[PDB]
Design a protein around this ligand. Sequence first.
Ligand code: SYG
Lengths: 300, 237
Amino acid sequence: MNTVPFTSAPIEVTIGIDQYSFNVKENQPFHGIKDIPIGHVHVIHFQHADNSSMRYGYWFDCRMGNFYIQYDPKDGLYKMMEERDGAKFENIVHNFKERQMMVSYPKIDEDDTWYNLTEFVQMDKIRKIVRKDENQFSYVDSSMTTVQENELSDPAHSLNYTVINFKSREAIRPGHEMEDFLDKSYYLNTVMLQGIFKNSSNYFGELQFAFLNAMFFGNYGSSLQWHAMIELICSSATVPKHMLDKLDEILYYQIKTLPEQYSDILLNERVWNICLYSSFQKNSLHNTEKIMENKYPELL
Amino acid sequence: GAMNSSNYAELFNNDIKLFVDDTNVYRVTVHKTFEGNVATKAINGCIFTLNPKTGHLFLKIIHTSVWAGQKRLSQLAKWKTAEEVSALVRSLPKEEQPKQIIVTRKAMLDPLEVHMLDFPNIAIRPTELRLPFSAAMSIDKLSDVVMKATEPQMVLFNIYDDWLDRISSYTAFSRLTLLLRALKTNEESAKMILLSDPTITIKSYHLWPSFTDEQWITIESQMRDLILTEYGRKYNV
Ligand SMILES: CC[C@H](N)c1ccccc1O
């Protein structure tokens, strides 16, 4: 059970850790988050009380290092850093614990929500989408654009999601124009799964990561990516049976977790109606269709 | 973007462009079967690909054999249109290739876009104009060559005959669309107007009769009257 200590909390801020969140007042004696489950990636994130423009946060895996947060009064943000001195770090944490100046990761034992949202998400894949190789953790915020959005402007600050474009030569074999456009199976299975991602777990990992960035930061290009990766599967007539079953589970927990008051902007009516009611896989997403119908019948 | 009444002179500038109308690609007669069900029988069709500036018409005849054992024909017909238009473009010398293709029906956009991926600098555009190109099969010589075809065939025409010797492209297009609109609205009456005077003939190498300038004015007025007469019948106004 690992810990991310905080040097201090000098500005009022809502702090998130995965799907949980805590309000911290200016100069309150907050010194971190303990009991963080080992085995998953995690995200710590921040929305400042005084300025709600720019949600930001850090993806990390405590197995990869000892990480802490410290407020930078010059750039105006809570920054993640790595402490290389293990004794120094254990000492700081043990003192903060002894003074009970830390919140506990509030995981219900029965609850598999975070596992289910991050099942295929791997820190090494995050670091390839978010390139900053000098750190072991990854910064994401509300405003970062994706490579695809850019093509259509600072490359060092981009989200390098895999580009999906249904009207591209990559997606359309010469001589199979109609076939490949109406049935995206060759683009899904040969180009994307066999070629770029190598396996379905990596594809699902990027899909899950895109969703979480859309949800936690309102990152619009991530929402575009999540929907494109759903649509590519649903628009393929030939999909391994294990992938369809797993997709139904992935989307179910994503729809379950999405704040009800955010469905308007984060859910794309066209993709969902096409995926659940028109596409080849309209009948392969039973759990997802049931929760969408009971929770968001308007959109549909 | 979309072509409409606002940007209408763009059709007659010096950027090569083609209209593509797919209305008459997939043509069927609907009939009853011995058991009393309904069946279709295809007849030959055509793609109507027109340079509005020069009058050059690329009439690709679509022979019923292309549909043989094919399902979802109305969908397939859009993709076949797009395949044949892309093939036409590839067959033209580079300096003859269009810079824009305007589809008369928005459902042609995605099929044509996908077939034209090798041509990223050719813009595929819809149009808000209601154009009467479905009536192309009311031009006797075009209908005749389509029906007589026994195999796929491309036939080249100038749909303006020699009008451009005396009038501008804008005026020629306006005459063409008036004629076709009249033939679309009341074919029998329009054809009567065009052939009422036996002394005015169609040249072997033309589609329309050899009217003088003054006779064209009379014809055009008679076509406008026909369209208004028909309108007051449609709506009782
Ligand atoms: C983009 C900077 C802006 N003052 C800002 C907005 C919110 C939180 C931190 C932060 O520095």
